[PDB]
Amino acid sequence: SVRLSGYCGSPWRVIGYHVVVWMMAGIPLLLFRWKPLWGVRLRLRPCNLAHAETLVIEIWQLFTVQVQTEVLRYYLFQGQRYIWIETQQAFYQVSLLDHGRSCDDVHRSRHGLSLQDQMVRKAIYGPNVISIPVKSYPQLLVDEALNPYYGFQAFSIALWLADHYYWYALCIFLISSISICLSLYKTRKQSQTLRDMVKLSMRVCVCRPGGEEEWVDSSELVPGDCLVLPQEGGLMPCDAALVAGECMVNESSLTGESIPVLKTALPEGLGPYCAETHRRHTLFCGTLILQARAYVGPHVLAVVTRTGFCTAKGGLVSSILHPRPINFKFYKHSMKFVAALSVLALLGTIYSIFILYRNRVPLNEIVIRALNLVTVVVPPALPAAMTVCTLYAQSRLRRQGIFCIHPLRINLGGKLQLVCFDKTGTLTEDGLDVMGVVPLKGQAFLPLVPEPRRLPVGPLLRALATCHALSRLQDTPVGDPMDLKMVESTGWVLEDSAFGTQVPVPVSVLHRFPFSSALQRMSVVVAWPGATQPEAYVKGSPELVAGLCNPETVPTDFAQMLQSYTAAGYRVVALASKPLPTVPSLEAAQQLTRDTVEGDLSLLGLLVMRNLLKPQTTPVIQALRRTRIRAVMVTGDNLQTAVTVARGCGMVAPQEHLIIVHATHPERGQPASLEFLPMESRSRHLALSGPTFGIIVKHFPKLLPKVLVQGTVFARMAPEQKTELVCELQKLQYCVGMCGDGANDCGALKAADVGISLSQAEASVVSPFTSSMASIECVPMVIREGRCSLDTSFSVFKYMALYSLTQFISVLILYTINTNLGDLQFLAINLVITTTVAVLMSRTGPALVLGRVRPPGALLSVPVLSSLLLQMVLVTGVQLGGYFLTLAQPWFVPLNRTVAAPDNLPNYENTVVFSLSSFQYLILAAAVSKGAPFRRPLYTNVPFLVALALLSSVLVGLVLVPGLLQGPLALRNITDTGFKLLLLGLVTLNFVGAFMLESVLDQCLPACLRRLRPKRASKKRFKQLERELAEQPWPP
């Protein structure tokens, strides 16, 4: 959904808008920064998009994008480049400008681009640079410091100086500057981090037609251009397709996969070159080329396909620079809650005006004092407190090993209700493991031998340790992980190729037949000293190998045994051998045909390779299921293995039923039909594959919501089907986490509300959340931190409300008695007592254990609002009681009403109110700070506990110790001590009452509101579906 509206240039209109906004007032600027579409409409006039010199983009977020000329008319929106293709009268993204061309076209491009034809491609595509723009500190200030909040704070600073409250004005300015500097630091540091993370400048050779080789910078590369990759291998500057040769690529830079991966030349064909399909023929930007071998030609060649932000790493960086808006609204009914507090403040302000008039204070002072009171209820430290809360959450995660690039995504961990787990690498170990070999003695399967090392030397062990296509790179074999683990299990050392006995003669590979996907098997020619004839070893699927094997050698239990193995999640391959009467020699063996070796084989044994469940997986899954979080397996693997793992890891506990949803494709003459196949070992789970998921999404849209609500295993899911599933689940108002670790989970991790990658490093761009640890234990950690962050932010906002209302009430009372709180008494209460205690309260770590109860999401809920209105009742009661109680004393002398504050100060009324309110701020900071269920107790926060104790001691000294800070703060000295003790008793009464009020609310109001009003329904579509199912199960 993209809306474009061209605005052709108009000088007179532009200058008219200029003067109007610059002269009239700042209100138009405020409403333009709120609603800038009218600003552009008045500043420039609509035009035919073929003539636009400025665009307005809506994705209903609105951006304005000028249009550059290079004749090429193009614009840049969020890094991507859109060009004006004059013929079709539309701005087409350059990403698609050459989309869909055939692999044959890519191969034909292997002669490169003529320098004359390279300028056009450069102008279209632009430089091959993922340019992170640098904003100057002045411009960072202007961006941060021009908010409406800081504008109001500057207004307040001006007012407090109008009334001569210089210390409080300095306090506001310092708090606001500290607020602005945190934002500037983090925003500038992140930009400088990305700028160097995407930094790359090589001198890459290219193949300019005519036969000459041209050396150019890394930024002069354009799609279709041809690269000459060095034999030694270095970083990859562009996102090229490998046309000739092969090269080891360490793709950890892009996807975090630590192991080298083989890239093979692109195959000639008429299909479209797809980076996701032909991902074994594509070289990505930022990955490292370890070796590059040119089997034909003097050097290896790749064809540039994507450059700049078009590259995969470019898209990953763009998703960090331009994140999609976070799904949850933190301020649920922002205007309504702020309006409740604002109507309270408005009633107070009108009361203040009425009483100031009744006190016969001049009108200018009336207006100034009313505006000061209105400013009291906008705490200068609110943005600082919120940002600091997010920073603390991020730091705690980073110390746990979890790295979130966007700290505001952390609160989405405490909103999670469903987590999708990739099976392999995330739930189960990275690669397969060998639990044994099943040799034969004639036509009978021998008992499984757990480890193949002790197998007596023979054709089976030689096949195990030799029948493979490994290549020793840097003394570390590389290739298919299955072969790696098989040969490692044999224990033999790879030194064509020879293998030495671990403890018994070395064995040589006379000839090797490379594996093929269509052949489902591979064969080799193997000889060893003392061997009369070479032995050719063949490994392949059980049925196919058995078919070529001699029938009298295959036991009748072959099919039954392999099916029994498959049922238990094992993957099985068969090993066969045949003696070749050919003389043992390198040259003679090389002429043997693949058909000769593959045919007339002997079944020697069956090899079973199991992918194991990580030790930390089952506890985490069971903890999530105990918290009533949905654990879903979204894998691209078989359904048998997926269901076996799901049962094993506790997604399907032994008592639940598992039903297979199978959707038949609507073959000729019949429509699509669902059939359900129950299994015998959230009480009903569904398991369905990728084909079934697609058929249900297309043909069965009525039944998709139920499948998604009660589906558990999603096997054989294509990488786009994972993203489709995540989006479909989010359509049900789920908050979906995706703990996929692999590279193919990229779209799912980007779509998911919380996307986590398991085995990553510090500076990873793969997904919003990346952890350094292999196990899925980082998912409970993220959920616990998210719940802690939600509770902490709710408590900080509650404190900034309680704070603000307490100061408002104190100022109202002092206006009533016709004095004010005092300049340095404002400075203390705000700079020290409240800013310290608000930035320190958000330092309390998450509770160590997940619980079934979830944090709220509504700041306007009855709990929060009742807590505020009953804390404020006790605050006002305590202050009023202390005031009315200092009148009854004998030594009391009413303040001089004729003069106005600060001329009244010091006086007993202001002193009493200041003391009580100063204690009340600390009392409220401690009261709003909760421990369990979501946070650790208050006392585990040593800085916060120490701040509370130190400030309480200082305030007790102010109340008791005479002459301590009574000059600066302008406090009146009370000679009496019984009154001081009574004041401390009243403060202790408020402390006890506030904690008792919080406890009583937390314990009773939930039950009270549940009994008082039963839920009409659950707003969540998935909860409605869960009810509709519990009343009547869908699969009957």
PDB file of N, CA and C in Angstrom, residues 323-397:
ATOM      1  N   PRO A 323      13.175   0.361  10.918  1.00  0.00           N
ATOM      2  CA  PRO A 323      12.349  -0.724  11.449  1.00  0.00           C
ATOM      3  C   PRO A 323      10.872  -0.463  11.215  1.00  0.00           C
ATOM      4  N   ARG A 324      10.122  -1.539  11.016  1.00  0.00           N
ATOM      5  CA  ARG A 324       8.677  -1.418  10.948  1.00  0.00           C
ATOM      6  C   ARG A 324       8.139  -1.021  12.322  1.00  0.00           C
ATOM      7  N   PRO A 325       7.049  -0.257  12.380  1.00  0.00           N
ATOM      8  CA  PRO A 325       6.544   0.190  13.684  1.00  0.00           C
ATOM      9  C   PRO A 325       6.231  -0.989  14.591  1.00  0.00           C
ATOM     10  N   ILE A 326       6.573  -0.836  15.873  1.00  0.00           N
ATOM     11  CA  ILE A 326       6.327  -1.899  16.836  1.00  0.00           C
ATOM     12  C   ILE A 326       4.829  -2.135  16.947  1.00  0.00           C
ATOM     13  N   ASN A 327       4.445  -3.403  17.098  1.00  0.00           N
ATOM     14  CA  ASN A 327       3.040  -3.765  16.948  1.00  0.00           C
ATOM     15  C   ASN A 327       2.190  -3.291  18.120  1.00  0.00           C
ATOM     16  N   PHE A 328       2.745  -3.252  19.328  1.00  0.00           N
ATOM     17  CA  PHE A 328       1.951  -2.907  20.497  1.00  0.00           C
ATOM     18  C   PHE A 328       2.015  -1.406  20.737  1.00  0.00           C
ATOM     19  N   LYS A 329       0.891  -0.845  21.164  1.00  0.00           N
ATOM     20  CA  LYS A 329       0.820   0.552  21.566  1.00  0.00           C
ATOM     21  C   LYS A 329       1.064   0.626  23.067  1.00  0.00           C
ATOM     22  N   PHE A 330       2.201   1.205  23.458  1.00  0.00           N
ATOM     23  CA  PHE A 330       2.529   1.277  24.878  1.00  0.00           C
ATOM     24  C   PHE A 330       1.497   2.095  25.638  1.00  0.00           C
ATOM     25  N   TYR A 331       1.058   3.211  25.061  1.00  0.00           N
ATOM     26  CA  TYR A 331       0.097   4.097  25.707  1.00  0.00           C
ATOM     27  C   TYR A 331      -1.294   3.762  25.175  1.00  0.00           C
ATOM     28  N   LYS A 332      -1.863   2.682  25.705  1.00  0.00           N
ATOM     29  CA  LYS A 332      -3.229   2.304  25.362  1.00  0.00           C
ATOM     30  C   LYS A 332      -4.176   3.373  25.885  1.00  0.00           C
ATOM     31  N   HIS A 333      -4.853   4.068  24.974  1.00  0.00           N
ATOM     32  CA  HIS A 333      -5.655   5.238  25.318  1.00  0.00           C
ATOM     33  C   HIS A 333      -4.775   6.316  25.952  1.00  0.00           C
ATOM     34  N   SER A 334      -3.743   6.704  25.200  1.00  0.00           N
ATOM     35  CA  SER A 334      -2.852   7.767  25.650  1.00  0.00           C
ATOM     36  C   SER A 334      -3.637   9.031  25.955  1.00  0.00           C
ATOM     37  N   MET A 335      -4.437   9.480  24.988  1.00  0.00           N
ATOM     38  CA  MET A 335      -5.196  10.707  25.174  1.00  0.00           C
ATOM     39  C   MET A 335      -6.173  10.582  26.329  1.00  0.00           C
ATOM     40  N   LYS A 336      -6.798   9.417  26.502  1.00  0.00           N
ATOM     41  CA  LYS A 336      -7.809   9.280  27.545  1.00  0.00           C
ATOM     42  C   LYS A 336      -7.198   9.264  28.945  1.00  0.00           C
ATOM     43  N   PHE A 337      -6.091   8.544  29.146  1.00  0.00           N
ATOM     44  CA  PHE A 337      -5.452   8.559  30.463  1.00  0.00           C
ATOM     45  C   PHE A 337      -4.843   9.925  30.761  1.00  0.00           C
ATOM     46  N   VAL A 338      -4.131  10.498  29.786  1.00  0.00           N
ATOM     47  CA  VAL A 338      -3.592  11.837  29.969  1.00  0.00           C
ATOM     48  C   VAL A 338      -4.717  12.831  30.187  1.00  0.00           C
ATOM     49  N   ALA A 339      -5.903  12.567  29.634  1.00  0.00           N
ATOM     50  CA  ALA A 339      -7.035  13.465  29.814  1.00  0.00           C
ATOM     51  C   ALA A 339      -7.670  13.312  31.186  1.00  0.00           C
ATOM     52  N   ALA A 340      -7.675  12.107  31.749  1.00  0.00           N
ATOM     53  CA  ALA A 340      -8.096  11.960  33.139  1.00  0.00           C
ATOM     54  C   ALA A 340      -7.181  12.760  34.059  1.00  0.00           C
ATOM     55  N   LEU A 341      -5.869  12.555  33.919  1.00  0.00           N
ATOM     56  CA  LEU A 341      -4.944  13.317  34.753  1.00  0.00           C
ATOM     57  C   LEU A 341      -5.020  14.809  34.446  1.00  0.00           C
ATOM     58  N   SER A 342      -5.309  15.172  33.196  1.00  0.00           N
ATOM     59  CA  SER A 342      -5.360  16.571  32.800  1.00  0.00           C
ATOM     60  C   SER A 342      -6.632  17.255  33.269  1.00  0.00           C
ATOM     61  N   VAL A 343      -7.752  16.536  33.350  1.00  0.00           N
ATOM     62  CA  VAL A 343      -8.944  17.125  33.943  1.00  0.00           C
ATOM     63  C   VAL A 343      -8.748  17.291  35.440  1.00  0.00           C
ATOM     64  N   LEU A 344      -8.073  16.341  36.094  1.00  0.00           N
ATOM     65  CA  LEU A 344      -7.702  16.561  37.489  1.00  0.00           C
ATOM     66  C   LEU A 344      -6.870  17.834  37.629  1.00  0.00           C
ATOM     67  N   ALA A 345      -5.838  17.967  36.793  1.00  0.00           N
ATOM     68  CA  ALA A 345      -4.984  19.147  36.838  1.00  0.00           C
ATOM     69  C   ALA A 345      -5.752  20.420  36.502  1.00  0.00           C
ATOM     70  N   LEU A 346      -6.732  20.343  35.602  1.00  0.00           N
ATOM     71  CA  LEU A 346      -7.501  21.526  35.229  1.00  0.00           C
ATOM     72  C   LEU A 346      -8.409  21.972  36.366  1.00  0.00           C
ATOM     73  N   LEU A 347      -9.072  21.021  37.027  1.00  0.00           N
ATOM     74  CA  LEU A 347      -9.840  21.369  38.216  1.00  0.00           C
ATOM     75  C   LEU A 347      -8.945  22.039  39.245  1.00  0.00           C
ATOM     76  N   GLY A 348      -7.761  21.472  39.474  1.00  0.00           N
ATOM     77  CA  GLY A 348      -6.842  22.087  40.413  1.00  0.00           C
ATOM     78  C   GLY A 348      -6.409  23.478  39.989  1.00  0.00           C
ATOM     79  N   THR A 349      -6.163  23.672  38.692  1.00  0.00           N
ATOM     80  CA  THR A 349      -5.706  24.972  38.208  1.00  0.00           C
ATOM     81  C   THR A 349      -6.792  26.030  38.344  1.00  0.00           C
ATOM     82  N   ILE A 350      -8.042  25.679  38.038  1.00  0.00           N
ATOM     83  CA  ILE A 350      -9.121  26.648  38.212  1.00  0.00           C
ATOM     84  C   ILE A 350      -9.310  26.963  39.689  1.00  0.00           C
ATOM     85  N   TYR A 351      -9.190  25.953  40.556  1.00  0.00           N
ATOM     86  CA  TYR A 351      -9.226  26.223  41.989  1.00  0.00           C
ATOM     87  C   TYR A 351      -8.101  27.162  42.395  1.00  0.00           C
ATOM     88  N   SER A 352      -6.907  26.958  41.833  1.00  0.00           N
ATOM     89  CA  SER A 352      -5.770  27.807  42.164  1.00  0.00           C
ATOM     90  C   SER A 352      -6.018  29.244  41.734  1.00  0.00           C
ATOM     91  N   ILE A 353      -6.571  29.438  40.537  1.00  0.00           N
ATOM     92  CA  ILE A 353      -6.892  30.790  40.084  1.00  0.00           C
ATOM     93  C   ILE A 353      -7.921  31.424  41.009  1.00  0.00           C
ATOM     94  N   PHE A 354      -8.952  30.665  41.384  1.00  0.00           N
ATOM     95  CA  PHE A 354      -9.991  31.212  42.249  1.00  0.00           C
ATOM     96  C   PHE A 354      -9.426  31.630  43.601  1.00  0.00           C
ATOM     97  N   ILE A 355      -8.570  30.798  44.194  1.00  0.00           N
ATOM     98  CA  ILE A 355      -8.021  31.122  45.509  1.00  0.00           C
ATOM     99  C   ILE A 355      -6.987  32.237  45.422  1.00  0.00           C
ATOM    100  N   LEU A 356      -6.220  32.308  44.332  1.00  0.00           N
ATOM    101  CA  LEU A 356      -5.278  33.408  44.169  1.00  0.00           C
ATOM    102  C   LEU A 356      -6.017  34.727  44.003  1.00  0.00           C
ATOM    103  N   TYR A 357      -7.125  34.717  43.261  1.00  0.00           N
ATOM    104  CA  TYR A 357      -7.981  35.893  43.202  1.00  0.00           C
ATOM    105  C   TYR A 357      -8.515  36.239  44.586  1.00  0.00           C
ATOM    106  N   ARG A 358      -8.993  35.234  45.322  1.00  0.00           N
ATOM    107  CA  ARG A 358      -9.492  35.480  46.669  1.00  0.00           C
ATOM    108  C   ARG A 358      -8.406  36.037  47.578  1.00  0.00           C
ATOM    109  N   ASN A 359      -7.138  35.777  47.270  1.00  0.00           N
ATOM    110  CA  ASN A 359      -6.021  36.311  48.035  1.00  0.00           C
ATOM    111  C   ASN A 359      -5.575  37.681  47.542  1.00  0.00           C
ATOM    112  N   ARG A 360      -6.256  38.242  46.541  1.00  0.00           N
ATOM    113  CA  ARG A 360      -5.969  39.588  46.046  1.00  0.00           C
ATOM    114  C   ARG A 360      -4.503  39.727  45.636  1.00  0.00           C
ATOM    115  N   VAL A 361      -4.067  38.832  44.757  1.00  0.00           N
ATOM    116  CA  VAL A 361      -2.731  38.897  44.171  1.00  0.00           C
ATOM    117  C   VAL A 361      -2.900  39.475  42.768  1.00  0.00           C
ATOM    118  N   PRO A 362      -2.005  40.346  42.299  1.00  0.00           N
ATOM    119  CA  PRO A 362      -2.245  41.021  41.017  1.00  0.00           C
ATOM    120  C   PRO A 362      -2.367  40.043  39.857  1.00  0.00           C
ATOM    121  N   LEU A 363      -3.146  40.453  38.851  1.00  0.00           N
ATOM    122  CA  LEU A 363      -3.543  39.543  37.779  1.00  0.00           C
ATOM    123  C   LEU A 363      -2.339  38.930  37.077  1.00  0.00           C
ATOM    124  N   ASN A 364      -1.280  39.713  36.861  1.00  0.00           N
ATOM    125  CA  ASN A 364      -0.086  39.152  36.235  1.00  0.00           C
ATOM    126  C   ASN A 364       0.460  37.999  37.064  1.00  0.00           C
ATOM    127  N   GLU A 365       0.518  38.180  38.385  1.00  0.00           N
ATOM    128  CA  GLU A 365       0.943  37.094  39.255  1.00  0.00           C
ATOM    129  C   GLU A 365      -0.045  35.940  39.228  1.00  0.00           C
ATOM    130  N   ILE A 366      -1.344  36.222  39.109  1.00  0.00           N
ATOM    131  CA  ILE A 366      -2.321  35.139  39.031  1.00  0.00           C
ATOM    132  C   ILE A 366      -2.033  34.260  37.823  1.00  0.00           C
ATOM    133  N   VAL A 367      -1.840  34.883  36.660  1.00  0.00           N
ATOM    134  CA  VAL A 367      -1.608  34.106  35.448  1.00  0.00           C
ATOM    135  C   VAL A 367      -0.276  33.369  35.531  1.00  0.00           C
ATOM    136  N   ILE A 368       0.768  34.030  36.035  1.00  0.00           N
ATOM    137  CA  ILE A 368       2.068  33.369  36.114  1.00  0.00           C
ATOM    138  C   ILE A 368       2.007  32.178  37.063  1.00  0.00           C
ATOM    139  N   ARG A 369       1.357  32.339  38.216  1.00  0.00           N
ATOM    140  CA  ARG A 369       1.274  31.245  39.174  1.00  0.00           C
ATOM    141  C   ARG A 369       0.422  30.104  38.635  1.00  0.00           C
ATOM    142  N   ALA A 370      -0.670  30.419  37.935  1.00  0.00           N
ATOM    143  CA  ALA A 370      -1.478  29.365  37.334  1.00  0.00           C
ATOM    144  C   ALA A 370      -0.682  28.594  36.290  1.00  0.00           C
ATOM    145  N   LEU A 371       0.114  29.296  35.480  1.00  0.00           N
ATOM    146  CA  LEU A 371       0.933  28.607  34.488  1.00  0.00           C
ATOM    147  C   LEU A 371       2.027  27.775  35.144  1.00  0.00           C
ATOM    148  N   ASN A 372       2.621  28.268  36.231  1.00  0.00           N
ATOM    149  CA  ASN A 372       3.587  27.461  36.968  1.00  0.00           C
ATOM    150  C   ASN A 372       2.938  26.191  37.504  1.00  0.00           C
ATOM    151  N   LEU A 373       1.729  26.312  38.049  1.00  0.00           N
ATOM    152  CA  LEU A 373       1.013  25.138  38.528  1.00  0.00           C
ATOM    153  C   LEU A 373       0.728  24.166  37.390  1.00  0.00           C
ATOM    154  N   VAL A 374       0.336  24.683  36.228  1.00  0.00           N
ATOM    155  CA  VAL A 374       0.070  23.814  35.087  1.00  0.00           C
ATOM    156  C   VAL A 374       1.346  23.108  34.648  1.00  0.00           C
ATOM    157  N   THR A 375       2.489  23.778  34.776  1.00  0.00           N
ATOM    158  CA  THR A 375       3.760  23.161  34.425  1.00  0.00           C
ATOM    159  C   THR A 375       4.223  22.143  35.458  1.00  0.00           C
ATOM    160  N   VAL A 376       3.772  22.264  36.707  1.00  0.00           N
ATOM    161  CA  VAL A 376       4.184  21.308  37.736  1.00  0.00           C
ATOM    162  C   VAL A 376       3.805  19.885  37.343  1.00  0.00           C
ATOM    163  N   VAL A 377       2.702  19.717  36.605  1.00  0.00           N
ATOM    164  CA  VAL A 377       2.205  18.374  36.305  1.00  0.00           C
ATOM    165  C   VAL A 377       2.814  17.778  35.050  1.00  0.00           C
ATOM    166  N   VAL A 378       3.865  18.381  34.507  1.00  0.00           N
ATOM    167  CA  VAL A 378       4.613  17.791  33.401  1.00  0.00           C
ATOM    168  C   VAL A 378       6.032  17.551  33.901  1.00  0.00           C
ATOM    169  N   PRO A 379       6.342  16.372  34.434  1.00  0.00           N
ATOM    170  CA  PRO A 379       7.638  16.166  35.081  1.00  0.00           C
ATOM    171  C   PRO A 379       8.774  16.252  34.078  1.00  0.00           C
ATOM    172  N   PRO A 380       9.823  17.024  34.371  1.00  0.00           N
ATOM    173  CA  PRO A 380      10.933  17.130  33.413  1.00  0.00           C
ATOM    174  C   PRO A 380      11.655  15.821  33.168  1.00  0.00           C
ATOM    175  N   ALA A 381      11.527  14.844  34.062  1.00  0.00           N
ATOM    176  CA  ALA A 381      12.333  13.635  34.024  1.00  0.00           C
ATOM    177  C   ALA A 381      11.605  12.447  33.416  1.00  0.00           C
ATOM    178  N   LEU A 382      10.409  12.645  32.874  1.00  0.00           N
ATOM    179  CA  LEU A 382       9.675  11.513  32.314  1.00  0.00           C
ATOM    180  C   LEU A 382      10.409  10.879  31.141  1.00  0.00           C
ATOM    181  N   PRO A 383      10.821  11.620  30.106  1.00  0.00           N
ATOM    182  CA  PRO A 383      11.560  10.971  29.013  1.00  0.00           C
ATOM    183  C   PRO A 383      12.847  10.320  29.476  1.00  0.00           C
ATOM    184  N   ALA A 384      13.571  10.965  30.392  1.00  0.00           N
ATOM    185  CA  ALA A 384      14.800  10.375  30.906  1.00  0.00           C
ATOM    186  C   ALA A 384      14.515   9.069  31.623  1.00  0.00           C
ATOM    187  N   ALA A 385      13.468   9.040  32.449  1.00  0.00           N
ATOM    188  CA  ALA A 385      13.135   7.821  33.174  1.00  0.00           C
ATOM    189  C   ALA A 385      12.773   6.695  32.218  1.00  0.00           C
ATOM    190  N   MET A 386      11.981   6.992  31.185  1.00  0.00           N
ATOM    191  CA  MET A 386      11.590   5.943  30.246  1.00  0.00           C
ATOM    192  C   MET A 386      12.791   5.420  29.464  1.00  0.00           C
ATOM    193  N   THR A 387      13.607   6.328  28.921  1.00  0.00           N
ATOM    194  CA  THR A 387      14.771   5.888  28.163  1.00  0.00           C
ATOM    195  C   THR A 387      15.718   5.092  29.045  1.00  0.00           C
ATOM    196  N   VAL A 388      15.897   5.517  30.294  1.00  0.00           N
ATOM    197  CA  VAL A 388      16.789   4.810  31.201  1.00  0.00           C
ATOM    198  C   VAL A 388      16.242   3.425  31.518  1.00  0.00           C
ATOM    199  N   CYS A 389      14.922   3.297  31.647  1.00  0.00           N
ATOM    200  CA  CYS A 389      14.336   1.978  31.850  1.00  0.00           C
ATOM    201  C   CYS A 389      14.675   1.055  30.688  1.00  0.00           C
ATOM    202  N   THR A 390      14.511   1.554  29.460  1.00  0.00           N
ATOM    203  CA  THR A 390      14.834   0.731  28.295  1.00  0.00           C
ATOM    204  C   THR A 390      16.317   0.376  28.263  1.00  0.00           C
ATOM    205  N   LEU A 391      17.182   1.334  28.598  1.00  0.00           N
ATOM    206  CA  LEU A 391      18.618   1.077  28.591  1.00  0.00           C
ATOM    207  C   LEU A 391      19.000   0.024  29.621  1.00  0.00           C
ATOM    208  N   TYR A 392      18.394   0.078  30.807  1.00  0.00           N
ATOM    209  CA  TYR A 392      18.661  -0.939  31.819  1.00  0.00           C
ATOM    210  C   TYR A 392      18.225  -2.315  31.344  1.00  0.00           C
ATOM    211  N   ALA A 393      17.046  -2.404  30.725  1.00  0.00           N
ATOM    212  CA  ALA A 393      16.602  -3.689  30.198  1.00  0.00           C
ATOM    213  C   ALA A 393      17.597  -4.229  29.178  1.00  0.00           C
ATOM    214  N   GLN A 394      18.031  -3.367  28.259  1.00  0.00           N
ATOM    215  CA  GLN A 394      18.981  -3.787  27.236  1.00  0.00           C
ATOM    216  C   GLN A 394      20.294  -4.248  27.851  1.00  0.00           C
ATOM    217  N   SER A 395      20.789  -3.523  28.853  1.00  0.00           N
ATOM    218  CA  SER A 395      22.046  -3.901  29.490  1.00  0.00           C
ATOM    219  C   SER A 395      21.927  -5.245  30.189  1.00  0.00           C
ATOM    220  N   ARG A 396      20.805  -5.488  30.867  1.00  0.00           N
ATOM    221  CA  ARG A 396      20.610  -6.782  31.511  1.00  0.00           C
ATOM    222  C   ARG A 396      20.613  -7.907  30.486  1.00  0.00           C
ATOM    223  N   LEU A 397      19.908  -7.718  29.369  1.00  0.00           N
ATOM    224  CA  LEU A 397      19.923  -8.741  28.327  1.00  0.00           C
ATOM    225  C   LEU A 397      21.336  -8.970  27.811  1.00  0.00           C
TER     226      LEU A 397
END
